[PDB]
């Protein structure tokens, strides 16, 4: 909540940017802790919540996408089917003796024809997960402190068939919204995107 | 629950059930390693072209982890029992330690489970 | 054969079950184990099934604690258990007490996972049958130099030289000769790898043997490479 | 209790100073903040003392065991994804300890902050503890990569013996090791008033 | 053949062959000897030693159970004791859960369903010796004995053992309603020595318990100096 | 007791398992069933045993999830059992209790070779664990 | 139902532990002729202040093993410190169970000619010495028996014990509230314990300056 | 409170042989709308509509096991499941976690297709249920549902007329919500054919 | 009804070249009476050569007692009638006290004896095993008033003076008694009488110290 | 026979030939010999020899608590079992009573112990026997158990291989117990010992093991050091 994680969906792409904030109370660790974790060659999560939680759970989503392409000969998971899975595991942690994962959630990803018998995603996929297991599939979505001064920002400038400097840009003007009007400094934000080529780590907005 | 001692001793030092299970892998498909300097072949006997299977290719050489590859000659089923087992076992290591599962390590796994299988009672 | 249960005595009085698996470490490969005031000396035959074999991928010697050594004889898959339940309760002893753990309490420890075996389910799970694994523990603690011997029964005892394996009545025999209560680390080498040579089928290579030493002075064990193999051959 | 760590060209400088207040009365001035995990990897000492001791106690078991069965050492990402590990399982358990794994395995040194509620994070650059506000001012300030090994020491020696001088929770001797590729040594132990008249004589 | 092996199987004429092995067992012990005097009851064994340097007490056969209850063992003593520890259990439950010492027909009909749970499980096998319950409790002096098969029968004189027959014989010269403890002990320890034979158990010890009115109805052994010497 | 216990999952000289090869021998008298997979969809048909006359069926609504020799695992899988018809329905209910718990975690239809690895592991259990038989059962999956 | 005062003394012979026969129920004087004092084994009493209930079950629990062992074994009877010792142990358990024995003891014993005096509370403090007290007898008779033992050390007689146990008794009457003119005297000697029949200690109230004009507000 | 947290409103009304099953589309984070276009409705069958009220993830897992429950009894039982049966079972599935309560509120309609009778459900989040004639209505603008249905619904309505009428008691409810709006989502179930509508709503 | 209570008390260490001076007031009080004058649970002894000294909880030290005791005899067992020496012991209370670090012990240890070159070793622990070693060290009620005059006199710090000789057995069981002198003038929890373990390799010698009954 | 494959099977004469195979492995132990005077108990145990420069140890003689101790022989693994069993009952007992438990107390629970191996079918008896030397306020106690779990209370015993010459030593020495001294008990013990080895070993420090237990005396073991003062001078005049 303290770190803004922001994601868009456009016609060719999804670009995500996660804040690297990492604090004690009041004093500021580190701002460069990447907090977009890849799950497959063309999915990503960019998750906002304390380091331990975030870790456990994105490696034990990874861990388990990995272990289910070994035992199905390599066949990788539709971006839906992922999502759900996530969903399922958070939703059964708020039951459960442990507690909840204190994360939240922006599932990204781009889905291609596994052979030639696919019938179905071919475009990008987004979604917005809550910490109690809500699950969204949205254009645009955002966590943390900043999200709604981005969404509404959004709302006003996000188009469907944005390119990607264009969608660049928009990035560059939601962090620069987010640093503008937040008191906790967010200085750097940890763009990624995703594109039928995979996983791109982009340096120019930040 | 059944957990009768299988594997037992004979009166000459022999375990019965291993030596019988040892000849059962007697019968099955020749595989053959071979490490060189830079690459490990794997080779396996690819029982025959029946006319009758799959067109889809199905590889008889089991991806364990992204690095580690097993082949088998015995039971086909409790050769997928064991990779099934290897395969979780290299995914539980590598989300307790954050390093991937060394080869030595993994075969130390599946050897530590085969043992474990002639000295469990019921099995 | 299940017609006697595993729990069974024979007649004379002896568990059928663990003199079948004492006659198990007689189809084994042969292990040495020699006391000195300078140290303690563990040798080993490889008897590799092949010539392609990694012989470092075999070590009939592993390391349970920098103080303390154990060569097995028999099958060594059954003893690669009791090496891993012997370093658990070292570590587990200097993690308690903050000291190193005694030989004498190590092969306890290794007798007291052995012994656990049978059939009756109950409340625990036992094992199906005895080890078929004779250990040889070495090691150096308060007490100097110590040797200790494991059997399938469960029963440990300290020992001055004892050699286990296919080759060990010719292995006992050379030892009540040629062998005395002050030998130095050298003399207790050379007489190890002459009772090697008088009990191998094979011929004696630097890579067919493994040796080790746990030294009385410096208190830690030391692998032998086969050129220090070689360099005891070459005396 | 004042604890820094940090990266540079030639390794990893620890720093510690050695006091333990019971709050407002002094338990002891010779309390021992570096915890020589091994040979070749250290800890740090942060918060409760008893969790830390004995967790970290825990680890070099663990590590001893990783050594015994492959082989092989530890790498410093298993180590302190040993201890991360154990401390989420116990995030409810009501745990108090903040400590730092550094260590020179085969990819080079590496330096992970670990919290008591299963958090494991990988700078260049950390402090812990109540004094660490002082410290990061001092240490911020003065650190780039390029230090020479002396200049290193001196910087963290520095910043702890700052930290000592302005918190009340921190002070008595400022401890500095080294962390390098053939292990760790114990750069020095001074007398923080000795540190004092040092850099402010007269 | 095979049906013989265990507890929980038949035989063709509707036998446990099993249990009547343990009764044989106990057919092979030495000899006890119970008589119920109307206000009391006394209970003797005959001790067998197969050493002379035994110490005085060894291999004690008369455990007291309770306060006004004990127990005999004829055969094999081990079982006897675990028998004993259970009736030991039973009349302590009683004290405790009804706030009552355990009448001796309930802690025989206790001892006898917990001897006969042994004869029907395969994976047990049945006690190889008899029970002699002697109790004084609120329903007067009784006297039961428990069978490895686990059926109780009350009595009034009761003989166990070896020389079980010509024990029975001399108990029926009795009459048991003017029959007194305090002559009773004599009379079971004199029946004890004559129906022994002295060549084949040279070391033997006569062990005589006793409780009724002069006991305060307390399950005692008998003093030293009150058995005859043979 | 343990003298009458038939050691079922036990290893015999040959390094062969009675309990399977029985089980094989008793497929084999099984009504035939025969599978063909095409490019435009895949065909089963199978044997039923002679009609009598005094036979009935069941009046079910929606006659496409169960016939007399083929059954329905989920909307997109079949099957066709041969052997031991009774052992044959506690695996058919094992694999749509399976398939729909891939659809309740994943909300995907689970795939055809995933859901006959996950039933093989359940044949091949009985066969080194348990103590008792093995399933008498043979599938063909669609 | 609760116990008032508990006390006891050793003197030069034996132990004494006096203590009134009244359960109450708060503030309700609810029984007057319970007894309170309970023989443990042959050679030892037991009296304790606080809950009845827990006091009746921990000593049946402490008789049920004394008599079951000297029954069951052919042993000698436990002697009064491995006694206390048995009980002391069993309120820590409960205690450590967090289902304490809500009771402070006072325990009383001789055998062969060796006397035993001890204290044990409800959480499980155990103490021993020569003059034990639980309840407002800790703040009231306590120092007054320290007073009396320390003004002879050789040794209190028996007359001397009871006398200044009478004294403590009488004013524990006084300042005590929940307490009755009605006590019972259990005597630990080497022939075994002897528990006296209830008595009453004689009081006075006609101070001059207790009158009614004297203490008026007017 | 928990159930309010999601927002979201569902209602169901009764018409001759037929009904019309209805739902906002708004989904939000106590204040601030996450989505404008989700709507709460499920289909079990061609007789079957239910809706789900509550926090959302609640909503998702009991749709998940419904689907769940519902597709192993068609397995098992060649049939589909009719209303009252599912209602049952779903009554069941709420009461078993009845100290542990998922926090959704189920809006049951169903026909008999060879009938035509009508059987609407409405249960507590413990399952305790309610079968009116007339219509039920849950979420967050309950009330409002409640007062509209009162004051507009009538026995004999058309499919068409009860349309009309669902719509504008849930335009008029969500209205006075702030939980609750962004257009709406309905469902004209008839014993012939199933027809799906999308209302025009406030952007508010 | 709490299950934790405090029964005062004060505890002292000092560690010399060759013998270690142990210290613990006799007295016992309860909630506000005075149990006994003369409690000698407070030290303990674990092996010839090795004591531990608890403050706090009467019933916890007890407690601690006798786990510590039959651990040490099940080491002896274990290891051929091997005593345990100072630090295993040490290490052994502190991994002791650590399991019960979810319902602690209500106690305040210190374990002190000699070590392998028969030098005196003091250790200080924690509620919760936390172990610490120094040569000196005060533990109870009545630590803040003497642990200070102890650093005055042994560290000899702002003293700009030459060091005194180290000291002897007589001259730090005078400045022990010395410091619980003081304290028992001051702390209204502590003092009756001081029981003293002076312990060398020549055995153990034991010593009783008078001090005010108010 | 086709009756003693199993513990829970009657023999048709009414025998159990599990529990007498138990019996007859402890008849091949080493021997060892138990002597009871007025106040003190001492045993003494046989070991091996060495083979003329190899000397090897194994662990008979345990000490259960300060009071007791006892010697095995048969199958050493369950003379290890029963005694870390009988050393957490006397260190729970000594927990609970602050005193050490009564020897007859105890040889109850160890015939208990032996008899709850007998009876079911997933168990085997304990191959060893026991002899327990303790004291207690009840004065010196000697006990002998069995695998069957009978336990007899002796005043002079021995068992192991070759032991009935022991035994019959003994029988002619055993009623003048009560006033022999500590001293002349040991060489007693000894005696009977040396009557139990074979016919060209004399009994000397290397190969025994002297156990010693008393009123004031905690259960001593003596071995290769403190046995001089026994062995050093002795011998065996006939
Ligand atoms: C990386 C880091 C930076 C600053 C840290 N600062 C404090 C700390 O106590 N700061 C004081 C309070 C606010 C200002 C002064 C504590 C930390 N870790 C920690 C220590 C012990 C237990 C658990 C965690 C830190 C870790």
Redesign the pocket.
Same mark, same amino acid.
């Given at each position: 909540m303290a770190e803004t994680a922001i994601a868009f969906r456009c016609k060719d792409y999804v670009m995500v940017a996660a804040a690297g904030l990492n604090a004690?109370?009041?004093?500021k660790?580190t701002d460069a802790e990447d907090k977009i974790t890849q799950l497959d060659t063309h999915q990503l999560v960019a998750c906002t919540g304390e380091n331990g939680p975030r870790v456990n759970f994105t490696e034990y989503i990874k861990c388990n996408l990995a272990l289910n392409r070994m035992r199905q000969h390599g066949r990788h998971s539709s971006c839906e089917s992922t999502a759900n899975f996530m969903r399922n595991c958070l939703a059964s942690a708020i039951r459960s003796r442990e507690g909840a994962y204190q994360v939240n959630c922006l599932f990204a990803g781009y889905d291609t024809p596994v052979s030639e018998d696919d019938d179905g995603v071919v475009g990008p996929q987004l979604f917005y997960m809550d910490y109690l297991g809500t699950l969204q599939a949205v254009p645009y979505g955002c966590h943390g402190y900043g999200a709604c001064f981005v969404t509404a920002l959004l709302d006003r400038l996000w188009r469907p068939d944005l390119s990607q400097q264009e969608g660049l840009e928009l990035m560059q003007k939601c962090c620069d919204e987010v640093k503008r009007r937040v008191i906790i400094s967010n200085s750097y934000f940890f763009v990624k995107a995703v594109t039928k080529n995979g996983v791109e780590v982009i340096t120019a907005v930040h | 629950s059944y957990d009768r001692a299988i594997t037992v001793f004979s009166p000459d030092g022999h375990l019965f059930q291993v030596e019988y299970a040892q000849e059962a892998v007697k019968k099955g498909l020749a595989a053959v390693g071979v490490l060189g300097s830079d690459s490990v072949v794997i080779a396996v006997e690819k029982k025959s072209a029946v006319k009758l299977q799959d067109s889809r290719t199905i590889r008889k050489i089991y991806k364990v982890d992204a690095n580690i590859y097993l082949a088998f000659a015995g039971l086909s089923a409790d050769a997928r029992v064991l990779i099934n087992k290897a395969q979780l076992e290299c995914q539980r290591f590598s989300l307790n330690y954050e390093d991937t599962m060394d080869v030595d390590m993994l075969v130390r796994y599946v050897a530590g489970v085969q043992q474990k299988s002639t000295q469990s009672g019921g099995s | 054969e299940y017609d006697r249960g595993v729990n069974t005595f024979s007649p004379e009085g002896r568990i059928f079950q663990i003199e079948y698996a004492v006659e198990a470490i007689k189809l084994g490969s042969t292990s040495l184990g020699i006391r000195t005031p300078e140290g303690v000396v563990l040798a080993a035959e490889k008897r590799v099934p092949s010539t392609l074999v990694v012989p470092s991928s075999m070590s009939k010697i592993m390391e349970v604690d920098s103080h303390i050594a154990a060569v097995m004889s028999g099958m060594v898959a059954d003893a690669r258990i009791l090496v891993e339940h012997a370093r658990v309760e070292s570590q587990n002893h200097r993690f308690t007490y903050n000291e190193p753990m005694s030989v004498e309490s190590c092969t306890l420890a290794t007798c007291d996972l052995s012994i656990q075996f049978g059939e009756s389910g109950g409340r625990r799970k036992l094992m199906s049958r005895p080890f078929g694994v004779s250990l040889l523990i070495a090691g150096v603690d308060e007490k100097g130099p110590q040797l200790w011997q494991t059997d399938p029964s469960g029963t440990h005892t300290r020992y001055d030289a004892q050699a286990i394996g296919g080759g060990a009545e010719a292995a006992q025999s050379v030892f009540t000769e040629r062998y005395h209560r002050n030998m130095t680390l050298e003399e207790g080498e050379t007489l190890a790898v002459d009772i090697l040579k008088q009990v191998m089928e094979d011929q004696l290579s630097p890579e067919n043997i493994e040796v080790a030493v746990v030294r009385a002075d410096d208190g830690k064990l030391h692998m032998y490479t086969p050129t220090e193999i070689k360099a005891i051959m070459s005396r | 209790?004042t604890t820094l760590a940090f990266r540079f060209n030639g390794g990893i400088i620890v720093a510690v100073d050695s006091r333990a207040s019971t709050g407002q009365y002094i338990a002891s001035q010779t309390v021992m903040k570096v915890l020589e995990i091994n040979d070749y990897l250290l800890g740090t000492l942060?918060?409760?003392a008893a969790d830390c001791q004995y967790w970290e106690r825990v680890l070099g078991m663990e590590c001893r065991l990783w050594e015994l069965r492959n082989g092989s050492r530890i790498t410093v990402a298993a180590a302190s994804k040993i201890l991360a590990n154990i401390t989420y399982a116990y995030r409810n358990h009501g745990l !108090?300890?903040?400590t730092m794994v550094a260590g020179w395995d085969q990819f080079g040194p590496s330096l992970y902050?670990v *919290? *008591?509620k299963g958090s494991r =994070?990988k700078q260049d650059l950390?402090? =812990?503890?109540?004094? !660490?506000?002082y410290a990061?001012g001092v240490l911020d300030t003065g650190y780039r990569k390029d230090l020479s090994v002396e200049d290193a020491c001196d910087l963290a020696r520095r910043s702890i013996f700052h930290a000592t001088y302005r918190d009340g929770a921190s002070g008595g001797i400022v401890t500095v090791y080294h962390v390098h590729e053939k292990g760790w040594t114990k750069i020095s132990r001074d007398d923080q008033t000795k540190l004092y008249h040092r850099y402010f004589p007269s | 053949s095979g049906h013989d092996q265990s507890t929980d199987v038949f035989s063709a004429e509707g036998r446990v062959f099993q249990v009547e092995y343990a009764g044989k067992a106990v057919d092979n012990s030495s000899t006890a000897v119970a008589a119920c005097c109307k206000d009391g009851v006394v209970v003797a064994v005959e001790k067998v030693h197969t050493s002379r340097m035994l110490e005085k007490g060894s291999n004690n056969r008369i455990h007291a159970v309770d306060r006004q209850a004990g127990i005999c063992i004829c055969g094999l003593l081990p079982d006897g004791r675990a028998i004993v520890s259970r009736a030991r259990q039973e009349a302590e439950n009683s004290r405790d859960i009804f706030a009552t010492p355990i009448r001796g027909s309930v802690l025989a009909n206790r001892v006898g369903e917990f001897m006969h749970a042994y004869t029907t499980h395969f994976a047990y096998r049945p006690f190889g010796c008899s029970a002699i319950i002697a109790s004084y409790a609120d329903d007067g002096p009784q006297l039961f004995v428990s069978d490895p098969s686990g059926t109780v029968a009350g009595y009034y004189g009761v003989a166990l053992g070896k020389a079980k027959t010509v024990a029975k014989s001399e108990l029926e010269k009795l009459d048991f309603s003017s029959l007194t403890c305090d002559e009773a002990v004599g009379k079971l320890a004199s029946i004890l020595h004559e129906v022994h034979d002295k060549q084949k158990d040279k070391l033997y010890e006569v062990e005589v318990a006793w409780v009724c009115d002069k006991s305060d109805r307390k399950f005692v052994h008998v003093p030293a100096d009150m058995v005859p010497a043979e | 007791s343990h003298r009458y216990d038939s050691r079922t999952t036990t290893f015999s000289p040959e390094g062969r398992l009675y309990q399977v090869e029985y089980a094989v021998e008793a497929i084999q008298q099984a009504g035939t069933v025969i599978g063909v997979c095409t490019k435009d969809g895949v065909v089963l048909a199978g044997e039923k045993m002679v009609p009598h006359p005094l036979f009935d069926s069941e009046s079910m609504q929606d006659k496409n999830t169960s016939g007399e020799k083929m059954y329905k695992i989920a909307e997109h899988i079949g099957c066709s059992v041969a052997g031991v018809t009774s052992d044959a329905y506690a695996l058919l209910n094992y694999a749509r209790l399976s398939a729909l718990r891939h659809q309740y975690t994943f909300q995907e239809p689970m795939a055809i070779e995933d859901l006959c690895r996950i039933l093989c592991d359940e044949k091949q259990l009985y066969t080194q664990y348990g103590g008792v038989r093995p399933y008498g059962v043979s599938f063909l999956l669609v | 139902a609760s116990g008032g005062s508990v006390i006891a003394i050793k003197y030069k012979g034996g132990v004494l532990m006096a203590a009134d026969t009244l359960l109450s129920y708060g503030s309700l004087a609810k029984w007057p002729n319970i007894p309170r004092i309970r023989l443990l084994g042959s050679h030892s009493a037991v009296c304790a202040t606080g809950s009845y209930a827990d006091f009746q079950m921990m000593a049946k629990q402490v008789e049920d093993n004394i008599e079951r062992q000297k029954m069951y074994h052919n042993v000698d009877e436990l002697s009064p410190s491995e006694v206390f010792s048995y009980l002391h142990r069993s309120i820590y358990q409960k205690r450590c169970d967090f289902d304490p024995c809500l009771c402070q003891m006072v325990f009383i014993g001789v055998r062969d000619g060796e006397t035993f005096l001890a204290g044990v509370d409800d959480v499980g403090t155990r103490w021993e010495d020569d003059c034990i007290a639980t309840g407002y007898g800790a703040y009231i008779a306590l120092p007054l028996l320290r007073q009396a033992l320390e003004k002879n050390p050789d040794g209190l007689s028996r007359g001397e014990a009871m006398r200044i146990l009478t004294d403590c008794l009488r004013v524990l009457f006084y300042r005590e509230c929940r307490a009755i003119n009605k006590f019972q005297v259990a005597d630990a000697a080497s022939d075994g314990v002897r528990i006296s029949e209830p008595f009453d200690v004689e009081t006075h109230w006609e101070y001059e300056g207790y009158c009614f004009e004297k203490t008026a507000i007017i | 409170s928990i159930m309010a947290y999601s927002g979201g409103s569902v209602m169901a009304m009764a018409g001759k042989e037929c009904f019309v099953i209805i739902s906002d589309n708004r989904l939000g984070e106590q204040l601030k709308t996450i989505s404008t276009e989700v709507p709460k409705l499920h289909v079990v069958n061609d007789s079957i509509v239910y809706g789900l009220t509550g926090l959302r993830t609640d909503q998702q897992t009991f749709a998940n096991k419904v689907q769940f429950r519902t597709e192993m009894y068609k397995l098992r039982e060649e049939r589909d499941i009719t209303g009252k049966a599912f209602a049952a079972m779903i009554t069941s599935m709420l009461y078993e976690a009845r100290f542990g309560p998922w926090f959704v509120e189920p809006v049951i309609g169903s026909i008999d297709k060879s009938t035509g009778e009508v059987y609407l459900c409405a249960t507590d989040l413990i399952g305790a249920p309610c079968e009116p004639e007339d219509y039920v209505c849950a979420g967050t603008a309950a009330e409002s549902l409640h007062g509209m249905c009162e004051a507009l619904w009538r026995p004999g309505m058309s499919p068409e007329e009860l349309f009309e009428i669902a719509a504008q008691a849930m335009l008029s409810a969500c209205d006075r919500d702030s939980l609750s709006g962004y257009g709406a989502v309905a469902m004209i179930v008839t014993k012939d054919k199933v027809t799906t509508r999308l209302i025009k709503g406030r952007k508010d | 009804w709490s299950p934790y209570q405090d029964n005062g008390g004060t505890t002292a260490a000092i560690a010399g070249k060759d013998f270690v001076i142990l210290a613990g007031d006799t007295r016992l009080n309860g909630d506000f009476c005075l149990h006994s004058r003369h409690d000698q649970s407070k030290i303990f002894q674990l092996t010839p050569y090795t004591y531990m000294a608890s403050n706090g909880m009467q019933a916890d030290r007890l407690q601690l007692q006798q786990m510590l005791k039959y651990r040490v005899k099940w080491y002896k067992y274990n290891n051929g009638g091997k005593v345990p020496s100072t630090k295993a012991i040490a290490q052994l209370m502190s991994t002791m006290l650590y399991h019960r670090r979810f319902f602690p012990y209500y106690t305040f240890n210190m374990v002190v004896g000699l070590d392998e070159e028969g030098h005196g070793v003091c250790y200080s622990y924690d509620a919760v095993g936390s172990t610490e070693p120094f040569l000196y060290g005060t533990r109870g009620s009545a630590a803040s008033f003497v642990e200070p005059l102890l650093d005055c006199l042994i560290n000899r710090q702002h003293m700009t003076s030459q060091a005194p000789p180290e000291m002897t057995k007589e001259e730090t069981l005078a400045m022990l008694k010395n410091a619980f002198t003081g304290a028992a003038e001051r702390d209204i929890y502590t003092g009756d009488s001081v029981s003293f373990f002076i312990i060398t390799k020549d055995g153990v010698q034991q010593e009783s110290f008078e001090l005010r009954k108010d | 026979n086709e009756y003693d494959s199993d513990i829970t099977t009657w023999s048709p004469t009414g025998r159990l030939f599990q529990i007498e195979y138990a019996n007859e492995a402890v008849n091949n132990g080493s021997a060892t010999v138990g002597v009871k005077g007025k106040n003190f108990v001492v045993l003494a145990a046989l070991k091996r020899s060495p083979v003329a420069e190899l000397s090897s140890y194994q662990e008979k003689v345990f000490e259960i608590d300060e009071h007791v101790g006892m010697s095995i022989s048969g199958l050493v693994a369950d003379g290890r079992v029963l005694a870390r069993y009988l050393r957490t009952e006397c260190m729970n007992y000594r927990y609970m009573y602050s005193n050490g438990m009564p020897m007859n107390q105890m040889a109850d629970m160890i015939g208990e112990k032996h008899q709850r191996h007998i009876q079911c079918s997933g168990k085997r008896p304990f191959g060893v026997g026991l002899l327990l030397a303790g004291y207690d306020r009840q004065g010196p106690h000697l006990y002998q158990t069995v695998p069957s779990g009978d336990v007899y209370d002796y005043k002079a015993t021995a068992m192991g291989v070759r032991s009935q010459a022991s035994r019959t030593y003994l029988e002619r020495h055993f009623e003048h117990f009560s006033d022999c001294t500590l001293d002349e008990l040991v060489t007693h013990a000894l005696k009977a010992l040396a009557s139990a080895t074979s016919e060209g070993i004399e009994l000397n420090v290397k190969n025994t093991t002297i156990a010693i237990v008393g009123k004031d005396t905690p259960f001593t073991i003596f071995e290769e050091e403190s046995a001089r003062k026994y062995l050093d001078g002795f011998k065996m005049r006939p």
């Open positions: 004690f109370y009041y004093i660790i | - | - | 209790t942060a918060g409760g !108090s300890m903040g902050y *919290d *008591d =994070v950390f402090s =812990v503890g109540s004094g !660490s506000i990061y | - | - | - | - | - | -």
